[PDB]
């Protein structure tokens, strides 16, 4: 026919609708969630530091609207506050699993409506879940292993080690081994990058070998000459956020530089929006 322009015919119409994304950052107060995320989007947001005297975990769910050359993204940032800071751990993941459930619920109950609209809807589902792990240095902590025990089947969880400038590299690798075995001790299949689309699969494959990442974030831009890049300052040195030997902020910014964002949406809608429906939606009909 000579007209292979079918794939381009739907790209040009989605940008008219605009995009919508969501992000869940899970970690106890103090690990630098708001700071890391403000550095990730290179913007100053409305999240002020919280208090250790929060009796119950709450969800910020602060929404925004950014812009680029053509796209008009409608971000929806949700972050836990007052999590994992008291003597209670087996009842910590409840207010951060009911959230994803209730975000499934609205889209579901609009999908079954009679005069339903789907060309333009604001999908409020959580599309990814970063998981900050304290930089202890022996193995995964209790709350961490219990939370990834019963959360991996709902969102494409991604384990990253926060505040990773207090762990030596000569030790860090062992920590990785000493955590990854626990991953295969309980046998939790944390998000495996596709590694099937032969066009780009080897980047995902090597990303999975360093799957336990390490990150750091700060809204202070220190070293100059090269550019106004953000770093860390201490009386005995400076830490480069993207040096590829200090931290893997670039490697974590491969879901943001978008090696796979649409894959996250697809796996949310076909492997987490299905196990909530292939099994859990069997309350009424077809039994």
């Amino acid at each position: 026919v000579g007209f292979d322009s079918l794939p381009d015919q739907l790209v040009n119409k989605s940008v008219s609708q605009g995009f919508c994304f969501n992000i869940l950052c899970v970690g106890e107060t103090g690990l630098g969630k708001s700071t890391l995320m403000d550095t990730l989007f290179n913007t100053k947001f409305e999240g002020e530091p919280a208090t250790h005297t929060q009796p119950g975990v709450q969800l910020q769910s602060n929404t925004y609207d950014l812009q680029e050359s053509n796209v008009r993204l409608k971000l929806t940032i949700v972050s836990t506050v007052g999590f994992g800071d008291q003597i209670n751990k087996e009842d910590s993941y409840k207010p951060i699993v009911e959230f994803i459930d209730a975000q499934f619920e609205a889209y579901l109950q609009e999908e079954l409506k009679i005069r339903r609209v789907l060309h333009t809807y604001h999908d409020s589902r959580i599309h990814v879940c970063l998981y900050f792990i304290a930089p202890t240095g022996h193995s995964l902590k209790s709350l961490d292993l219990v939370t990834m025990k019963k959360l991996d089947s709902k969102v494409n969880i991604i384990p990253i080690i926060a505040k990773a400038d207090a762990i030596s590299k000569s030790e860090l690798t062992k920590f990785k081994i000493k955590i990854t075995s626990e991953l295969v001790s309980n046998g939790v299949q944390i998000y495996q990058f596709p590694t099937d689309d032969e066009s780009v699969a080897e980047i995902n494959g090597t990303m999975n070998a360093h799957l336990p990442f390490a990150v750091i974030g700060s809204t202070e831009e220190l070293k100059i000459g090269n550019k106004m890049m953000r770093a860390r300052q201490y009386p005995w040195g400076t830490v480069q956020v993207e040096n590829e030997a200090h931290c893997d902020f670039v490697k974590l910014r491969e879901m943001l530089i978008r090696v796979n964002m649409e894959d996250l949406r697809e796996q949310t809608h076909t492997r987490h929006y299905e196990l909530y429906r292939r099994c859990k939606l069997e309350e009424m009909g077809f039994k």
Binding site: H52, I87, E90, G137, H138, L145, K169, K178, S185, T238
Partner: protein, 234 residues
Amino acid sequence: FTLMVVGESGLGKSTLINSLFLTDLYPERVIPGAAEKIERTVQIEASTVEIEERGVKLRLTVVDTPGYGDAINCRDCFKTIISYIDEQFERYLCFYFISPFGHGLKPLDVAFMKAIHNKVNIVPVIAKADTLTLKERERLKKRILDEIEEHNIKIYHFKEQTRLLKASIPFSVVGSNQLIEAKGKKVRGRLYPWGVVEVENPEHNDFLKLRTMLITHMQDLQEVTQDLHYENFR
């Protein structure tokens, strides 16, 4: 003669003590399995260390506390430590480590300090000090001073060194088992991708200040434990 080394199992107590007293207190110790530390019980072992300084004591034993933290839920979480200190204070008839990964005094600080500050004089210590900027250091120090002041917490109190010690109560410390080199100063360093952190630099931290305070006020600790807390004991 009473002291504690209490922390969240990963602050760095083992290397800190081992470099403070030049010991190998645990030649054969294994980290509890990750799948096994769900109901992480708290247990106490013994110690055997001879101290060499200007003054030589008979012997020194530290209250090693494996498995104090890492609890799904602290049912007791406080029993064996108080039992051991009470037994050690009955035979006649204190470092608390604040993690830097937080806005200040996390919970379990007010409870523990309020429980034991009337039993043994407590020395607050911020572990893993090599991750706090000076502005944040001062901010958190002011915050913890306000918090201990707000709920009526008493901790502790030529003379230039005395004023310096009394102006910075929450000492910042690190621990370094193996000596590493940096810019010609190679004494018990830790390696990082940006070089080496040196334990004995007075500006990075106050480790040597803590060592001097402990090694010179051992008589002070002995007398306060034998005169003040002993009266409250009975």
